[PDB]
Amino acid sequence: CKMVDKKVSCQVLGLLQVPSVLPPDTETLDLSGNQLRSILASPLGFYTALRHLDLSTNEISFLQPGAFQALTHLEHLSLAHNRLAMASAGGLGPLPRVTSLDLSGNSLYSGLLERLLGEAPSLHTLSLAENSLTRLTRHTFRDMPALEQLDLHSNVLMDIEDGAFEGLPRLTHLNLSRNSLTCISDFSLQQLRVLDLSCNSIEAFQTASQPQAEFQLTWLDLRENKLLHFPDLAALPRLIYLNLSNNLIRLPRPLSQLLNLDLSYNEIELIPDSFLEHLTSLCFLNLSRNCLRTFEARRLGSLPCLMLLDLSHNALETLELGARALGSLRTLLLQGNALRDLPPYTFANLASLQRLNLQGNRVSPCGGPDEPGPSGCVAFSGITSLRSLSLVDNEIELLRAGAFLHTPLTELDLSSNPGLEVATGALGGLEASLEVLALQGNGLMVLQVDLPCFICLKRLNLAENRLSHLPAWTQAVSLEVLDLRNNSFSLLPGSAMGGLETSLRRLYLQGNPLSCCGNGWLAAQLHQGRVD
Amino acid sequence: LSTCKTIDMELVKRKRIEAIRGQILSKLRLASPPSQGEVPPGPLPEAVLALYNSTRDRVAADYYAKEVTRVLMVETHNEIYDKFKQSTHSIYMFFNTSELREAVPEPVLLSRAELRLLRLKLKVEQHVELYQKYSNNSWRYLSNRLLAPSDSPEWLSFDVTGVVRQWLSRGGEIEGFRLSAHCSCDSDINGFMNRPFLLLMATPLERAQEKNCCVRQLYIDFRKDLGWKWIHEPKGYHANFCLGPCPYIWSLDTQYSKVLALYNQHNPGASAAPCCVPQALEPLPIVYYVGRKPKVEQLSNMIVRSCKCS
Amino acid sequence: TCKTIDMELVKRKRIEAIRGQILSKLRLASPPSQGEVPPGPLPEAVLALYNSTRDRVDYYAKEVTRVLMVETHNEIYDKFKQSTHSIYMFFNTSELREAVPEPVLLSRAELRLLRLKKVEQHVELYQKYSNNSWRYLSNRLLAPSDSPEWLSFDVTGVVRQWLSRGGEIEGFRLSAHCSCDTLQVDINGFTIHGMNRPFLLLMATPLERAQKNCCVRQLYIDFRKDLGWKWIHEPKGYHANFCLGPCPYYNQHNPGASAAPCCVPQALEPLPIVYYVGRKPKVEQLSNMIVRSCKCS
């Protein structure tokens, strides 16, 4: 075995029993991955100085009683993925100084766990995941008061008798993910701070009512369950995180301190007005992939602290969000909905909006003071705080002259809007602010914008368009990458794009009908600072 | 954090009444129950009651894997030909019992035994039937088949589970079936080499050993639970319902043996979302008045006899 | 109508369910060890056995209506009489049309025989279009009985084609089986004689009524890829399925499941597999593995 000062690290394979040739002064011993089929006390007892002992992933089945009692200084024992459940009553004797014990993967079952272990006064962490535990009887976690973290995921836990966690006053972390629980009738773990009940079959979740003591839960994960309702979390004031995603939660303060609510994939069709009041101080609200039809946050002071609002892939038809209501909203996701007509100043009233995704909708912009548009248009012309906008697949046929004249955004995407007739100077206000622009799949015949005039532009995309010539560059370009795939481009002379090479480092021309003879300087551009 | 203790049937029963009323109305294509008062009071006529009694009255594990094995028919050259050769209308498939018992060491283990034949005759329709060798002389009928013509060879499957089990437990050295042409009182295959064989399927000898989904009783009387007088027969029926939530059990490569049996009662079908649903149902015949003539009608899949997870 | 499915999660749920299902059906505590599996292909006999086992080999109510047999003394005794061989029955086809006017309305029809009282008797049911016609329907093995009992043959198609093109009088023949190398059973009406005679208990649709969602989804299972199992030798994965989709509140529908219905399989097909348990190979068949079609219940 490899040797280090006061530490022995036996390799993955090669040993059948615990070696007897190691120094008695060994303080750390690693034997994981080996064919050790048992732990007899005689060879192991020589190393009383052991503090860590990794027997993980061995074939151990029989532990001789008193084997781990002799190592008074042992602090961490790892028996993960062994064959303990095929056994040694009291196989693990008393463990006065063991701070961590890993038993996951052994396929321990209810009843054998209660006799396999012994007194462990100083146990801080216990891992029982990937076992065959089915029931948490009254007598499961006795004789370990100092436990602070308990791991029980990937088990088959269906039942939990009242008071199974009564012997764990200091527990702070309980992980019951990927278990078989089906209905939770109570919650009285005042000490607990993290609870993971995700990936279970829970149809209902309930807690204590009008308790005489406070609760310390801060992180509840109740997702991918069968929950049919939003749980009554009035007794959990300190909850900070809540992820009810992938449930069946139809909707018909308790959550004043919740900061991150994930309520997506929950068959929700309506958000009652009283609901959003309880979510004061919320900072993230994910309502994606619901059957929601309209968002009605018209009340002043609704969701004051919300920084993100995700409503993607709903059936949303209109937004009733009020002026100065979503004050702190930085990001608003709305892709995949059915927005057609809105009040012109819907998104302009969002005081601190920074990113707006409208892909897959069918909204139509308008230019405000320059070239006013029809009724029902949405006024992007004056969203001062906006910095990134997406209008992909909005079926916009005509873009107005003053579409973004007073919105200094940094990135704009208009891709896959077939037949987009860009009015001359439509993007005029973005010359000194925009850094990335995309117009892929528009099919437009000519660029109706002074593209070199965009001093701040860094990247551009014009792929899958009928374009034939580019506006004439005449100075050192701030552009860095330019994408021109599948277009009708025939020539790229220096008079048309010279000056790009000062900052350009990547180019795409494949699929275009370049003149085999007249391309000229294109071959030299391909030498350095170009590709394909 | 204790698990949910009990289920209140006093709500689910009424919620079943609500749905079964609608099912009764829908099965008869009725928007609302008909008016009962117009028809004069009196007994249902005797012939109609006889019809209603004719329809009412009676007339006349699989989850765990099964090891499959096959025993090939003896050669026709030595055991079969000498006394039961092939005739114009019959064939005789004989099997060795010693190797049959070798395939399945105990008769209790046998779950299924399919005698399989391959047919070369293609186009001529024929009626053929299967008999057991029952004694030194006699034969007993198993089953028959109508050979729908087809242009290509095809495999026939005859279920012989009971015969094969009887053969394992009491059979002699040599035994077999007769497959012969149908004929009345007033009036081919390979081997007669892909020859017929018995595809036995048995449990391996090494493997011989209010919450869960179940059917729960409910009796409905049309007069008081649904408040109906228009339905005259029967007075009520047992619309028992299924309850007991089936939890999804998250699998794992290494599982304790007594926990591997939890799948067979909570998720036998390996569904992504199991639910406790009816498995077996039988109809409810009724008599009722619309217009001025009684109507005897059969409503299908009304009673619940078993429930299963998905 | 409303649904919020994550198809990927449903698929992974079924993958991890197939893992546990395969391991539980075989009652394997853990995947079998491959440490002593012989090299090379499977034995010829094992592959032959695997191929041998692998190869292939209404909602709405019905109107109940009896129609009685013609009196045996009136139309049957003129040409046929009960004998040691067979009993003969005939029905007024005009009465059948009166009970059920058009073929498209019939759903089920069964000839309700009554046995007065003996010995294990094999009886078969024929057609009789005419005296020279022969057409078999079905048969039953009647065990000895201590009491009279009704017995029925499902005869739906014959009655439907009678309604389509039947004449005036036609019927059946009930014959004792003739092993090719006697009608001891006694029937009512061919000895009380005049009533409880054989009849058809027709089921039909009345004229006043006669006039994506849950479906099977495709999901291939590759043992070596998505489960990581090296111990299943054939098949190299099998073409399992699942099903999904909303069910509105259907041939076998009944709302007695819960407050909302479910999309569940109706037809499932077994999966034969071959694998090595230590040194020797074993061919097993697992039932209810491959989803073919699904109900709403």
Numbering used by the authors:
A (entry chain I): 26 to 112, 116 to 280, 312 to 591
B (entry chain B): 1 to 60, 72 to 198, 206 to 210, 224 to 240, 261 to 361
C (entry chain A): 3 to 59, 73 to 132, 134 to 197, 202 to 211, 221 to 240, 262 to 299, 314 to 361
Per the authors:
Transforming growth factor-β (TGF-β1) is a multifunctional cytokine with key roles in development, immunity, cancer, and fibrosis. Interestingly, both TGF-β1 and -β3 LAPs contain the integrin binding motif RGDLXXL/I and bind to two integrins, αvβ6 and αvβ8, which together account for the majority of TGF-β1, and some of TGF-β3 function, in vivo.
In addition, we determined a 3.0Å resolution structure of L-TGF-β1/GARP from the purified L-TGF-β1/GARP sample. In most of the structure, the resolution is sufficient to resolve sidechains for reliable atomic model building (left). The local resolution of the density map and the temperature-factor (B-factor) of individual residues obtained from real space refinement of the model are consistent. We further subject L-TGF-β1/GARP to 1 μs all-atom molecular dynamics simulations revealing clear correlation between the per-residue root-mean-square-fluctuation (RMSF) and B-factor. Thus, local resolution or B-factor provides quantitative measurement of relative flexibility of specific regions, which clearly show half the straitjacket domain (including the lasso) is more flexible (enlarged view in the upper panel) than the analogous portion of the other straitjacket within the same L-TGF-β1. In the case of the fully latent L-TGF-β1, the straitjacket and lasso loops are relatively stable, as opposed to the partial latent L-TGF-β3, where the same domains are flexible.
